[PDB]
Write a protein that binds this DNA or RNA. Structure first.
Ligand SMILES: Nc1ccn([C@H]2C[C@H](O)[C@@H](COP(=O)(O)OP(=O)(O)OP(=O)(O)O)O2)c(=O)n1
Ligand SMILES: [Ca+2]
Lengths: 958, 411, 399
DNA sequence: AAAACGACGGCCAGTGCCATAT
DNA sequence: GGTATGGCACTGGCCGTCGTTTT
C-alpha cells in the first residue's frame, strides 16, 4: 500500500501483505459521500500530507489464518500450564487442620492426623499462601501457612525460634521464605493481596526470569464483581439514587466481605489484639498457637473464594490474552544499587536541612517577638495584641597568696551539696516555664520530652501564629484570623484594639502608592476595623487555611502579599514549602520499601565481569506491591510507583524513579504510546461509520498529526483556548471522559481569568456544539453510548464484560460516566496485555535475555542485557505495529496508517526517566544526574536506526 | 556604613584589639591587624574545634598532620618571596669589605637561593607526607590529611606581611571517582558553613576553572560590601604529586579495589579568620520591630559563643554568697561550661547595664544568686535569646545546661 | 636508643631514619611529628590549659603575631626577614654601587622586620589594654601557647612549641607568688609522671640579681631544662612605655603601684619527649598515662561473617566517638595477623584497651577486652563497655 | 498516724483544612 | 461534576494523681 481514500498514507508495500494480505476486503462500502460531506461542512479538509519514508522488514512468521488467531494461539500456549495447575486446586479436597502447630525451623508438612514432618520445600505445582510479618522488628517475615491440594504446610522463621542479641538490618535472600524448585516447572501461587506475600519469597529476586507466576483473589474480585471508587463508599455506608439491585453482588476491602459474598456462612473473626502490628516479638513468641490458628482461617477463606471465583473469570474473559496478561502483569521487578541508600540518605538530609532552616527562621521571629512584654508594649502592636500575655507565679509547698588550702574547695563543694540536699521541698511534677508568655509556652516542648530541643522547636508553618509572627499583609492591610470564618485580613476603619497602630501602618504604606473583595462581615465585632475573607480559588463563603499554600506563590510575586513591615523572605518560605511537600507526604512510604541485597556469590557472571562492577556496590531489587486490577477498570494500583510524577527542578524527592538503575552490564529499554487514550476513541468513532482510518474529523486530526503547524489535538486545543499545551490535557481528557458542561463551567471559573462569569456557560458551546446525538464533537456519543448500554457491556477488542456491579440489569442509570470511561480504560488494559504477551513471545523465540520491568501509567519498560539492547528496541517497535493492526482488525478495518505504525522513539537508558534528553536535577541533588552518580545521558532511536544497526535481522548472529 | 557600630562593639568587648584606625576593612581582610582580643581567641578556638570535630574526628580514614612554618633549603629564584636570615652572620659581615662594586650585588642571587621562606600554604607540607602516611591505612587510596595553622601572605616598608589562620584538608582519591568526591566534599563543606549561620542564604558557592583546565569550586560569604571568598576547592590531580617524587613512581601507587594506581590529589582550604569575621557580621541586627527594639546583641550560635553562662551575686551576707558562688563556679567548670565570674566585680553596675554588657558579649544565660538561694536554692536565670527570667533549683542547673548545649549541637 | 626506633615505626616522629637524631629533636630542627605525636602534644596542651587557665579567673587568653614590623633595636640574635622582592627588582637593574654594601646591610637591619623570639613581648604588648578587663585590679595574668623560632648553630632555624604565662603582681608579694606558681607547676609536671621523682627544680639568679627557678627532667643521658620561672621586676614594662607612668598604674588595696612581672615559660616539645621517655619502661610497651594517650582503645574483629561484624564494629565506633573516646579502626581490613603481633603493635602505640568482636557478640553480646597495664583478658557485655571506659578514665583523672 | 478530693497534666478521638493523583 | 487519602493543627472530653484537706 501507499495511499487510500482521503489520501492518508498507509502501511508499506511488503508489510501489509505480510500481516493482512490484499484479499478478503472491500473498498469500504464503495461510498465516501457522508465522510466527504462532513469533512467539508466542518471546513477541516486541509491537506498537509507529506509522506514519511517507508521501510521493508521480514516480519516474524505468524500463526493461523489472521492476526486474531495468532494472538489466541500464543495466549493459549502461554496460559495453558497455569490454568491446568489451577484446575488441580479446583478438583482436590484436603483433610482438616492439625490439632497443634509445630515449633521448628523452616517448612513442616502436616499429615492426615497432624503428624508433622519437616520438609525442605512444599514441592507442589499449586498453593494458597498467606504470610505474616512482625512489624515492630522490621520487614523479615515471621511465619506462614500454605494450603496444598493434599496437605497443610507451615513455615516458621529462624528469627522466631532462636534468640540472638541482634540481627542484620540489611535484608538478604537467605532471610526469606523459599519456594525454589530447581532442575511441572510452571508453578502457580494463589493468595489474597498476593503481592505482599510474593514480596517475601527467596528466589523472586533472581535476575533471570522466574517461571513461577502468581494470582490474586482481590484482582479477580475487582475484575468480576468489583466496585468503582464511587461505589465502594456507598456500599460500605449502606451496609445509586433509584436502583439498589447491585448492593448484593459486590464485596469490599477485607477478605471477610469477599468470603461473605461469594460463599457465605460463619463470619470471619478478627483478632482484637493484632499482635503482628502492635505487640512486640516476645508477645508473638508465646501466642504462637493462637496466632497461627487465626492465620489459617485466612488461607481457608481464600481457598473457598478462589473455588467460587475461577469459573466466573474464565467465563467473562473467554479470550486467553486476558489471562496471559494478568499472569505477566504482576511480575514487576525494579533493580536498585547502593545508590538507592545514598539517595535515601541525601533526600532525608536535604529535607531535614531545609525544614530546620525554615524552623530556625521562625524561631528567631518568636525570640524577637518575646521582648515586647516590657512596659506592656505588645498591646500597641497591630498583630500580637490578641494573644495571651500572662505569667504564672512560681509557687512551692507551704592582696595575699593562698596556702595549700585543700580545705577551702572541699568545704565549698560540701556546702554546695548541703544546699543541693533541699530537693524535698520541690513538687514532684515540675512546672513548665512559668516566666515565659503563654503563646511561647505552647511552643516549648516539655522538659521531660525524650527528644527535647532548645527553644520553641514546635513552631512550624500552617499555625495560627506563624503568619501572625511574620506580620503578613494583604494589599497593605495586616492579616486577621477568626474562629469560624478562617484566615483573612483586617482593614482600618471606624484586649484594647490598636486602631492607631493599624491606621498608621496603612498610612505608612499609602505614601508609596474603601476596599472591595470578600463581603465585609459585621459579625466579627471590631468597632474600628473591618474583616475581609482571603479569596480562595473556589467560591466565596468558604474558610481558608494557611496563606502559605502554593496557590499564593505567583500572587505574592505580584506584590500584594508581603512581609516587609515585620520581616521578609516570604517567597523563600513558600519556596521551601513547595520543595518539601512531596517528600513530607511520601517519606514514610518511600523509606519503607523492602530492599533485598543479593550477595556476590549468586549474581550472574555478566555483572561481575564488567569494568563498572563496584566491589563495594550492592546490587539488589525491589518488587512493587501492585494490586493488579485494583480498580473497577482493571488497572494496576500502587501509591508508590504507579503514578505520573517524575523528576522536577524544584521538588526534593522527585528523583525517585531515576534510582531504578540497570545493574552493570544491563540496560533499560522502554517506550510510551503516542496518546493511546485518544487513539482508542478516534479509531472507535472511525470504525463506527466506515472501514478506513480517518473516517471523521477526529481521526483525521489525530492521524498524521503535526506539532509544527500545531494541527495536533493538544496544540490545536491549546491555541484555541490560549493555555499551555502541557496544561491542556485536563481540558481534553475531562471533555473526552464525559465530564460535562458543569465541569467545563467550573474549571473555566477556576483555572484562570476571562473564562469565569457567563463565559463559563457560553464558551463551552464552542467546544461542544454548533448551530443530544450529533453535531461536531457529538459524533462519539453514537458509539460508546451504544456499547455501554447493551445487555452485556463488553470490550470491543478482547471480550470481557463489565463488572457485575455495573450490568444494565444491576444498575440501570447510575454510574453512566464511569460506565463509558470503562470502555476506553479497559481498551488500554487490553493493549497492555497484548503488548506484554507479544514481547514475551518474541523474547522466547529469538532468545533475548531481557524481561518485563514495569508498566507505569500506560508506559512500558524492560530490563535487557547490553549486548541485545538494539534487538529489544526492534522487538518493542514491531510489537506496537501488530497491536495496532489487531485493533484495526478487531474493529472491522483492514488498513493501518504509517503515522501510528510505530512509536515516536524507543528509549535505551541506564536508568528510569521520563525522557533520556533531560537531566534529573533536584534540591536533593543540584549536581547533574550525569555528575552526582556518574551515569551517561542515554538516547532514543527510531525504526530506521535500529533496522540499520540490526541489519534487519533479529537472530543473534548477523 | 552600619558596620561602624559593629566594629565599635567588637573593639569595646575585646573581640579585636588595637585602635579605630588600625581596625578597618582592608586590614582585617588582608590579615595585618594587631590581633584579636581574648573573646576573639575563644571564638576562634570554638570554630576550630567545631571544624575539627565535623571534619576529622568522625572519619575513620582522616589523620592529623603538622607542617613546619618555614621552607628551608635551596629555592627557585623566580618566586621573590620573603626570606629568612640569621644576623649573627650579618654582624660578621660588617667587619670588612670585599668585591663591593658589582659581584656582591649579584650576591643577591645567593641571597635568593640559600635562604628559606615562610610557609605560604599547608598544601606543600601535607603533600610532603603522602608517602609516609600510606602505612596508616595499608595503602587504601581514599584517605586524607587535615591541619589548622597560620600562613603568611605578602601585602601592599613598601610591602608587609599578613598572617592568616586556616584549615586545610588534602584528600587522596582514585582518579576515576575524583569529581564524585569533589561534589561530595563541596556539599558537605557548604552544609557545615550553613550549620551555625543564622542566615544560611548568605553563604553561596560557584564553579570555576584554572588556565590548565582543571575543575574547581569556591565558597563565598555576602558581607555588606560584597561577596568575599572564604573557602576554595581544587582538583589538583597529579601535577604536584608527580613533580615532587620523580623516578620510581611505583612508590606513589595505592590500592583502589583491586588496582594499584596513582591517586588524584584534591584540596580543600577554608580561612578561619575570615570565617570568624563572617560569623560576627552575621550575628548582628543591621521590620518596624527592629526600629523599636534597639537591643544590640551578637546572637552567636551556642556552640560557637566564647562565654556560655554569666554568674553574679545579689546583696546579702557576702561570705555565704561567696561560698555558694565558688562552689557553683567549680561545679560548672568541672563539666566543660565556661563561666564569667561577675560576682567579683562590685555592685557599682545596675541590672540593666549588666544585661546590656552581657548581651554585647554574647553570653547565653545569666544566673543570679541571693540569700533565697541559701534558704531554698532557687536562683534566677535570664536567657539571652528571650530576655526572660525564670526561677530554678540549683541541683539541676549543671544538667540542664549540659543538655541544652548537647541538644543544640546534635540538631 | 630503641625508643626512637619505636617512635619512628609507630608514627610518633615524622621524617626518615637518617634525619631523626637526639640533637635535632632537642634543638627544634627535626622534620616534624607524626599524627600520634601531634595528638599527644594536643592532649598535653589541653591538660596544661585545663590546669592553668580555666579554673583561675585571673588568667585570660591572648594572641600575639609571629612577627612585628617597624624600626628595630640593633644587637639581637633573632631572625630578620630580608626582602627578596627588593633585591630581585635590583637584580633586574643591578646598580654599580661601591661603598653602599655595608650601608645597605645597615638599612636592611634597620627597617626589615624579624620573626618571633618569645611570647613575653607579645603578652606585654597587651598589658595596658587587658588591664581594662579587670578594672585595673593589679594581680592577674595572661597565658598563651605558640610556636617560637630560634637560631641553631649557615645558622639554621628551629621551632619550639611553648606555653607561657605572664603574671602581673604587686612588688610586695612578688616572691611568694613566684614560689606559689613554682610549686603548682612542679606538681602538674608530676601529676602524669610514672616516676615523679625524675622531675626536679632548682634556684637561680639573673646577672643583675633577680631571683628565679628552673624545672628539669632527668633524661637517660642527663638533666634537661623544660620550664623557667623568672621574676623580672618592672624594667621591661617601663621601657616599653617610656616617660609617663600614670597609664601603667594598677590598683592593689586602693594603692597604685607598678606591677612586677613573673614569666613562666615551659616548652611542650621537650616535655612531650620527656613523657615519651618516662612512659617507656620483656614486652615493648609505652605505658602512657590514660589522660595523655592519643588513642584510647583499639577495635577489631575475629572470625565470622564480615558484613555483620563490620556493622557491629561501625556502630560501636560511632558510639565510642560520640562520647569523646578516640578509637583506632583496625576492623576496616582483616589483618590476617596472629593476636601476638596485633597485641605487640597496639602495645607499642600506647593503647589502653583492645576490643575484639565476633559472632558471639551477635549470639549473646559478649566482647573480648584486653588491658595494657595488667595484660589481662575479660569478657564483657557490649552495652556496658562505653560506661566502663568512661568511669575508668575518670578514675585515672581523679586519683 | 490513716483515708478522701480539686485544680491542673497525658492521651484518644473528632473536626477541619491542604497537597497529591486524575 | 463528585468524590476518597495522608498529614497535621485545634479542641472538647476522659482519667489520673499529687499536693491538699479531713479524721
Ligand atoms: N484530569 C485528568 C487528567 C488526566 N487523566 C488521564 C487520562 C490519560 O489516560 C492519562 C495520561 O495521560 P498523558 O498525560 O500521559 O497523555 P497521553 O496518554 O496522551 O500521552 P502524552 O503526554 O504523550 O500525550 O491522564 C484523566 O483521566 N483526568
Ligand atoms: Ca503517557
Amino acid at each position: 500500500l501507499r495511499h487510500n481514500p482521503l489520501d492518508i498514507q498507509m502501511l508499506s508495500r511488503g508489510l501489509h501483505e505480510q500481516i493482512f494480505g490484499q484479499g478478503g476486503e472491500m473498498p469500504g462500502e464503495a461510498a465516501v459521500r457522508r465522510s466527504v460531506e462532513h469533512l467539508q461542512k466542518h471546513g477541516l479538509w486541509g491537506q498537509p500530507a507529506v509522506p514519511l519514508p517507508d521501510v521493508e522488514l521480514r516480519l516474524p512468521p505468524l500463526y493461523g489464518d489472521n492476526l486474531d488467531q495468532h494472538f489466541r494461539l500464543l495466549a493459549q500456549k502461554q496460559s495453558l500450564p497455569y490454568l491446568e495447575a489451577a484446575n488441580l486446586l479446583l478438583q482436590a479436597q484436603l483433610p482438616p487442620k492439625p490439632p497443634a502447630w509445630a515449633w521448628a525451623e523452616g517448612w513442616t508438612r502436616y499429615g492426615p492426623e497432624g503428624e508433622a514432618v519437616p520438609v525442605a520445600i512444599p514441592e507442589e505445582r499449586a498453593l494458597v499462601f498467606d504470610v505474616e510479618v512482625c512489624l515492630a522488628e522490621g520487614t523479615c517475615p515471621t511465619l506462614a501457612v500454605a494450603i496444598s491440594p493434599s496437605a497443610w504446610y507451615s513455615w516458621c522463621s529462624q528469627r522466631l525460634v532462636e534468640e540472638r542479641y541482634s540481627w542484620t538490618s540489611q535484608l538478604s535472600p537467605a532471610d526469606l521464605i523459599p519456594l525454589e524448585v530447581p532442575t511441572w516447572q510452571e508453578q502457580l501461587v494463589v493468595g489474597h493481596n498476593v503481592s505482599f506475600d510474593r514480596a517475601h519469597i527467596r528466589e523472586q529476586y533472581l535476575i533471570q526470569g522466574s517461571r513461577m507466576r502468581f494470582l490474586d483473589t482481590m484482582s479477580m474480585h475487582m475484575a468480576i464483581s468489583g466496585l468503582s471508587s464511587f461505589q465502594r463508599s456507598l456500599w460500605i455506608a449502606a451496609k445509586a439514587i433509584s436502583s439498589w439491585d447491585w448492593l448484593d453482588i459486590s464485596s469490599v476491602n477485607s477478605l471477610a466481605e469477599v468470603h461473605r459474598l461469594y460463599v457465605g456462612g460463619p463470619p470471619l473473626e478478627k483478632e482484637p489484639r493484632e499482635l503482628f502490628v502492635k505487640g512486640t516479638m516476645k508477645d508473638i513468641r508465646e501466642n504462637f498457637q493462637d496466632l497461627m490458628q487465626y492465620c489459617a482461617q485466612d488461607v481457608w477463606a481464600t481457598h473457598e473464594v478462589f473455588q467460587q471465583q475461577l469459573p466466573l473469570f474464565l467465563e467473562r474473559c473467554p479470550h486467553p490474552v486476558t489471562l496471559a496478561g494478568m499472569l505477566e502483569m504482576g511480575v514487576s521487578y525494579l533493580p536498585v544499587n547502593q545508590n538507592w541508600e545514598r539517595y535515601l540518605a541525601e533526600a532525608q538530609g536535604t529535607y531535614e536541612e531545609l525544614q530546620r532552616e525554615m524552623k530556625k527562621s521562625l524561631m528567631d521571629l518568636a525570640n524577637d517577638a518575646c521582648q515586647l512584654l516590657s512596659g506592656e508594649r505588645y498591646k500597641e502592636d497591630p498583630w500580637l495584641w490578641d494573644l495571651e500575655w500572662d505569667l504564672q507565679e512560681f509557687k512551692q509547698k507551704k592582696p595575699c597568696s593562698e596556702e595549700e588550702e585543700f580545705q577551702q574547695d572541699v568545704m565549698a563543694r560540701a556546702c554546695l551539696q548541703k544546699l543541693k540536699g533541699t530537693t524535698e521541698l520541690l513538687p514532684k511534677r515540675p512546672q513548665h516555664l512559668p516566666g515565659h508568655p503563654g503563646w511561647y509556652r505552647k511552643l516549648c516542648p516539655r522538659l521531660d520530652d525524650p527528644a527535647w530541643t532548645p527553644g520553641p522547636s514546635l513552631l512550624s508553618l500552617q499555625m495560627r501564629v506563624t503568619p501572625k509572627l511574620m506580620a503578613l499583609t494583604w494589599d497593605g492591610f495586616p492579616l486577621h484570623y477568626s474562629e469560624r470564618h478562617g484566615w483573612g485580613y483586617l482593614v482600618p476603619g471606624r484586649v484594647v484594639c490598636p486602631y492607631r497602630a493599624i491606621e498608621s501602618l496603612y498610612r505608612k504604606h499609602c505614601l508609596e502608592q474603601y476596599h472591595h473583595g470578600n463581603g465585609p462581615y459585621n459579625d466579627v465585632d471590631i468597632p474600628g476595623c473591618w474583616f475581609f475573607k482571603l479569596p480562595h480559588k473556589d467560591g466565596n463563603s468558604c474558610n481558608v487555611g494557611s496563606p502559605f499554600a502554593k496557590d499564593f506563590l505567583p500572587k505574592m510575586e505580584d506584590g500584594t502579599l508581603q512581609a516587609g513591615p515585620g520581616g521578609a523572605s516570604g517567597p523563600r518560605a513558600l519556596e521551601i514549602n513547595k520543595m518539601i511537600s512531596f517528600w513530607r507526604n511520601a517519606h514514610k512510604r518511600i523509606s519503607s520499601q523492602m530492599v533485598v541485597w543479593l550477595p556476590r556469590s549468586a549474581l550472574p557472571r555478566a555483572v561481575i565481569r564488567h569494568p563498572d562492577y563496584d566491589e563495594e556496590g550492592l546490587y539488589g531489587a525491589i518488587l512493587p506491591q501492585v494490586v493488579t486490577a485494583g480498580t473497577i477498570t482493571r488497572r494496576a494500583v500502587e501509591p508508590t510507583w504507579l503514578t505520573a510524577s517524575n523528576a522536577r527542578p524544584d521538588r526534593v524527592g522527585s528523583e525517585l524513579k531515576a534510582m531504578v538503575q540497570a545493574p552493570p552490564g544491563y540496560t533499560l529499554v522502554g517506550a510510551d504510546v503516542d496518546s493511546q487514550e485518544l487513539w482508542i476513541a478516534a479509531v472507535l468513532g472511525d470504525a463506527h461509520f466506515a472501514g478506513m482510518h480517518g473516517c471523521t474529523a477526529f481521526g483525521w486530526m489525530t492521524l498524521q498529526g503535526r506539532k509544527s503547524r500545531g494541527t495536533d489535538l493538544h496544540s490545536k486545543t491549546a491555541t484555541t483556548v490560549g493555555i499551555s499545551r502541557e496544561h491542556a490535557k485536563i481540558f481534553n481528557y475531562g471533555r473526552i471522559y464525559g465530564a460535562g458542561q458543569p465541569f467545563a463551567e467550573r474549571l473555566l471559573m477556576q483555572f484562570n481569568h476571562r473564562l469565569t462569569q457567563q463565559e463559563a456557560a457560553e464558551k463551552a458551546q464552542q467546544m461542544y456544539a454548533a448551530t443530544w446525538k450529533g453535531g461536531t464533537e457529538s459524533e462519539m456519543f453514537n458509539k460508546l453510548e451504544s456499547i455501554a448500554t447493551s445487555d452485556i457491556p463488553r470490550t470491543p477488542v478482547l471480550g470481557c464484560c463489565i463488572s457485575r456491579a455495573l450490568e444494565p440489569s444491576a444498575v440501570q442509570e447510575e454510574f453512566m460516566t464511569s460506565r463509558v470511561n470503562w470502555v476506553v480504560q479497559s481498551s488500554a488494559v487490553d493493549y497492555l496485555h497484548l503488548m506484554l504477551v507479544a514481547m514475551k513471545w518474541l523474547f522466547e523465540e529469538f532468545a533475548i535475555d531481557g524481561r518485563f520491568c514495569i508498566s507505569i501509567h500506560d508506559e512500558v519498560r524492560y530490563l535487557v542485557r547490553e549486548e541485545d539492547r538494539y534487538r529489544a528496541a526492534l522487538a518493542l517497535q514491531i510489537t506496537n505495529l501488530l497491536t495496532r493492526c489487531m485493533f484495526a482488525y478487531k474493529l472491522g478495518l483492514n488498513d493501518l496508517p504509517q503515522s501510528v505504525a510505530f512509536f515516536s522513539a524507543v528509549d535505551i537508558d541506564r536508568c528510569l526517566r521520563k525522557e533520556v534528553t533531560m537531566d534529573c536535577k533536584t534540591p536533593s541533588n543540584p549536581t547533574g544526574m550525569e555528575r552526582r552518580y556518574g551515569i551517561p545521558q542515554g538516547e532514543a532511536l527510531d525504526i530506521y536506526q535500529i533496522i540499520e544497526l540490526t541489519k534487519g535481522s533479529l537472530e543473534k548472529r548477523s | 556604613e552600619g558596620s561602624e557600630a559593629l566594629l565599635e562593639i567588637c573593639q569595646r568587648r575585646h573581640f579585636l584589639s588595637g585602635s579605630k584606625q588600625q581596625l578597618s576593612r582592608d586590614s582585617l581582610l588582608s590579615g595585618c591587624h594587631p590581633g584579636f582580643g581574648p573573646l576573639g581567641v575563644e571564638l576562634r578556638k570554638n570554630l576550630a574545634a567545631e571544624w575539627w570535630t565535623s571534619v576529622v574526628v568522625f572519619r575513620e580514614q582522616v589523620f592529623p598532620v603538622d607542617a613546619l612554618h618555614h621552607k628551608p633549603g635551596p629555592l627557585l629564584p623566580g618566586d621573590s618571596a620573603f626570606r629568612l636570615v640569621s644576623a649573627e652572620t650579618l654582624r660578621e659581615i660588617l667587619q670588612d669589605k670585599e668585591l663591593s662594586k658589582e659581584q656582591l650585588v649579584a650576591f643577591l642571587e645567593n641571597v635568593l637561593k640559600t635562604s628559606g621562606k615562610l610557609r605560604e600554604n599547608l598544601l606543600h607540607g601535607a603533600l610532603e607526607h603522602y608517602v609516609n602516611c600510606l602505612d596508616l591505612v595499608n595503602k587504601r587510596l581514599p584517605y586524607g590529611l587535615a591541619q589548622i595553622g597560620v600562613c603568611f601572605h605578602p601585602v601592599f616598608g613598601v610591602k608587609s606581611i599578613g598572617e592568616k589562620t586556616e584549615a586545610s584538608l588534602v584528600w587522596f582519591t582514585p582518579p576515576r571517582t575524583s569529581n564524585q568526591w569533589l561534589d561530595f566534599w563541596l556539599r558537605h563543606r557548604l552544609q557545615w558553613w550553613r550549620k551555625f549561620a543564622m542566615s544560611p542564604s548568605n553563604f553561596s558557592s560557584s564553579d570555576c576553572q584554572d588556565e590548565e583546565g582543571r575543575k574547581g569550586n569556591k565558597l563565598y560569604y555576602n558581607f555588606p560590601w560584597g561577596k568575599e571568598l572564604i573557602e576554595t576547592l581544587w582538583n589538583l590531580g597529579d601535577h604536584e604529586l608527580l613533580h615532587m617524587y620523580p623516578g620510581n613512581v611505583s612508590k606513589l601507587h595505592g590500592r583502589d579495589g583491586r588496582k594499584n594506581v596513582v591517586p588524584c590529589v584534591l584540596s580543600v582550604n577554608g580561612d578561619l579568620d575570615r570565617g570568624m569575621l563572617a560569623y560576627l557580621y552575621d550575628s548582628f541586627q543591621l521590620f518596624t520591630r527592629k526600629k523599636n527594639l534597639h537591643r544590640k546583641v551578637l546572637k552567636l550560635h551556642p556552640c560557637l559563643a566564647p562565654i556560655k553562662v554569666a554568674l553574679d551575686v545579689g546583696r546579702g551576707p557576702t561570705l555565704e554568697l561567696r561560698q555558694v558562688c565558688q562552689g557553683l563556679f567549680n561545679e560548672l567548670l568541672e563539666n566543660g561550661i565556661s563561666v564569667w565570674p561577675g560576682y567579683l566585680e562590685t555592685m557599682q553596675s545596675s541590672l540593666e547595664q549588666l544585661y546590656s554588657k552581657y548581651d554585647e558579649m554574647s553570653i547565653l544565660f545569666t544566673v543570679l544568686v541571693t540569700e533565697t538561694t541559701l534558704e531554698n536554692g532557687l536562683i534566677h536565670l535570664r536567657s539571652r535569646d528571650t530576655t526572660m527570667k525564670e526561677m530554678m533549683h540549683i541541683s539541676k542547673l549543671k544538667d540542664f545546661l549540659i543538655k541544652y548545649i548537647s541538644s543544640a549541637k546534635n540538631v
